[PDB]
Symmetry: none
Subunit: 291 residues, 4 copies
């Protein structure tokens, strides 16, 4: 029913030529006026894709490249993760936890969620490193998902579940990091998750390096604040089943932990998850938060 009428695609001109752009968020709202995504993640994504593909055809428009689509599925996946996480802390009644969907480091460096005291220590570290004949640099990135535990960060609005997608609750789920900017105590993060389409070599390596970068950063903070009990775990979540070969490889030791006999041995990536269904998201978070 009336597709030449969908808004999941838009025409626009650039240099007098007409181009077509997909509108991922309108696609979501249009297909989720009464429920949130359930069952197979890949199935919900294929549906959204085909939906946009049907709308393009009914409008007799130029068809978007595989690229445009591969990118849109990512934006949809990001929204799915964010929404599920938002409803997870609600149904699990985790009043002291925030599971935030983070954008890329250039959009909003997650480090900005840290309070002033913590950021100054990291800034002092950076300045220290960059002050050497041969320049060394502290380069960090953003985990796709952050699990934070700090009761005072919880607003009552966060406790209302999302039963259907709207421009408003989607925007709120994707800009949650803005509410806690500069408010997080360094030891309030409990974990970070790197979400990958698959464990293809390059993507598996990204999990490994990111885990080393973030965990060592936290280890540095533990020495600055002299808090041996502070803990930060880093996880990986693949959209494809995980093979033993990849699982084996994701057992690699965090490099900063093999130079001091007093540090507990630990992997760069504490564990790897396979997300097929939305329930797999809840299961992953269950293992991450506790038990």
């Amino acid at each position: 029913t009336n597709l030449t009428n969908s808004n999941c695609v838009e025409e626009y001109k650039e240099n007098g030529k007409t181009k077509i752009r997909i509108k991922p968020f309108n696609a979501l709202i249009e297909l989720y006026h009464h429920q949130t995504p359930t069952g197979s993640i890949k199935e919900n994504l294929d549906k959204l894709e085909n939906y946009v593909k049907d709308v393009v055809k009914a409008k007799g428009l130029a068809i978007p490249t595989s690229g445009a689509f591969s990118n849109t599925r990512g934006t949809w996946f990001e929204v799915m993760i964010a929404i599920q996480s938002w409803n997870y802390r609600v149904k699990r009644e985790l009043n002291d936890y925030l599971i935030i969907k983070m954008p890329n480091v250039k959009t909003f460096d997650f480090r900005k969620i840290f309070d002033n005291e913590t950021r100054e220590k990291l800034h002092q570290l950076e300045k220290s490193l960059l002050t050497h004949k041969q320049q060394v640099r502290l380069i960090t990135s953003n985990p796709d998902l952050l699990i934070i535990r700090q009761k005072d960060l919880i607003k009552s609005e966060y406790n209302l579940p999302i039963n259907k997608l709207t421009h408003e609750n989607i925007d709120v789920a994707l800009t949650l990091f803005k509410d806690i900017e500069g408010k997080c105590k360094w030891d309030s993060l409990v974990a970070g998750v790197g979400l990958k389409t698959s464990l293809r070599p390059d993507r598996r390596l990204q999990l490994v390096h990111e885990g080393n970068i973030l965990k060592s950063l936290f280890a540095h903070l533990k020495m600055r604040y002299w808090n041996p009990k502070a803990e930060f775990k880093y996880y990986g979540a693949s959209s494809e089943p995980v093979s033993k070969a990849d699982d084996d490889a994701l057992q690699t030791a965090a490099t900063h932990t093999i130079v001091n006999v007093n540090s507990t041995p630990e992997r760069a990536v504490d564990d790897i998850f396979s997300l097929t269904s939305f329930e797999d998201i809840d299961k992953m978070l269950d293992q991450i938060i506790k038990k």
Copy 2:
């Protein structure tokens, strides 16, 4: 002629007839009476087009561009290994060895160490694997490994490779076999990762390997209580190095930011853009003493 080349093959995997490039034969065929010189890119293209010509003459399927990109890497790596072999000779660096390493599956890095060091590592490795959650020590092989240990030099290493033959190619690609189980840990001078380009994935491979190799070396420094032993890791690109990539390659070695007494260092000490074969010499000149 071209219908007779061996630089390309046709095999029957299960079902279809898949084609496969024979990188070393391409080399032996194009370099009969001399080793590659001048522009590295020129030689890579030359080798590439040669294959393409052969494939046309054979009237066989064209190998995928990805397949070419991979074979290009093998050629890049091998040609650099040959330069290094000859470099050691013309520079008369008797005590040094610039060894081309195979991939991890072919030969595990640790195997180069003598017994004293292997035992220390196996000990670190077993302690790791023995915890409620297993933590493994996974290592990688740097494309090139420079070591200084006088007693490992054979007189035949002093014979330059003036021509590429299935044989000159083998002495160079199996040189690592001669030193297996014989390297004192502090004999290692540096490792070098060779990439055709600093494409995101390849750049990260350099960053991780430097972290992997340097941390292991830092562990051994602790074990032997030798603060002075030094091990550097470098990267090399066949393409020019952008200011951006260079900045990304300044990333601090993670095991370096946990103790204030640690001299802060990069995961990759320096990146080199190898345009000509002379640039290879220039790189080695800096790596071995600058």
Copy 3:
């Protein structure tokens, strides 16, 4: 000339019995109305002693025990060290340095000279240690002499030399630590000196342990503030010549420096000095401040 008139001794009653107390400071003033102590330290001390002994005799008073005298010589030595140090920074024109004579830890814990930021880190360390099934405790002591470098701590009054002893300039030299309480940046201390009557076993051991206690404390601060360049040296100064046997023994490595291959090897006591003449005090300080 008129001793039955000296004030270097005082009578007082306690429980209806009359007792005699030496007044070390009056002895100093009375014998240094026109000059500060010079030449042999032991000679200046013996003189002061005999002086008080002559005054006791001229007053026909009960004679003070060896103890009372051994204690008074210490108070005199403390004043001598303090005065010499005060004139040293003046004649050497060290406008950014303060060489302070410190009392015992119970009178005024030297740690109180540290700014708030530094003291909180140490308090957090203490609380951390004392919070274990088996209680561990951070117990520090006071070096007898502190060399501090922080320009903003210098007052013009400090730049007036002391040409003769008075109740006023002696009091100022012995309470200098009060002017800088809570004002010192942790990395502003450059050194501490433990002053010993001799290197008798127990006294030599005190230098060794104190050096380990203070240097490790500073090493802890270097990790908290992430300043690898901050330096703190600890020295010993004996009032007797130093034998090779004792010098050898005072080469013992600071125990906290032998567990990490990345830390520079260092002695618990960086060097030992022999103070015979007042010039030996200047020489010691010269080696401590620089060159």
Copy 4:
């Protein structure tokens, strides 16, 4: 009788005729058909007065109170060494050895280690001594050293010392000779400093020795990469322990406050007040397993 004792001597140093107590003869003489029991203080006084009586009968000079205080320490130490010998036997602790160590000048602590460990320490020691300003590794001997290594136990260690003879005393005071160069580093369980009192100087001796021994052990843990090896150091007083002294003995081991991953620990893990010989057993019971 008393004019015949050998517990006291008269020697001609240069010039005068100085007297000298013979602590072991005092012991052999007072304990012919049984080892000391009951109150340690009682036995110390007994031994002391015995000497004093002998000195009177000999009509010789009275040794200084300081000299007595020192001989009191030797007796305290020795009697505790004998209890321990017998303790190991009655408890049937086959794998343990409770060794009385001589002073550093007589036998350097390190000498108890096997070759592998001595080499690691000599290496640490030479690296230290080789710097612009020499830094030495000076060690001390804990009065008692408890070790667990089954292959060092001789059947004759299982023979209790039922009487004090120049001979039972020697097996106990030379037991350390049997294990020289044979102790695996992680065979060390604990060390114990024995003081007649917690007088400031003696208290500090305990604090320093614990710092000295524990740091050395922590170095070896690093070298062997064995986080689990454990070494504790204890103090023991013949006098009761005041709340104040106990608090002073809570001082943190200095090598423990520099790395946040270090479990925080005391220089001296615990202090014991040995009033009776039974208290010695009680102490050993806690030290060996609690």
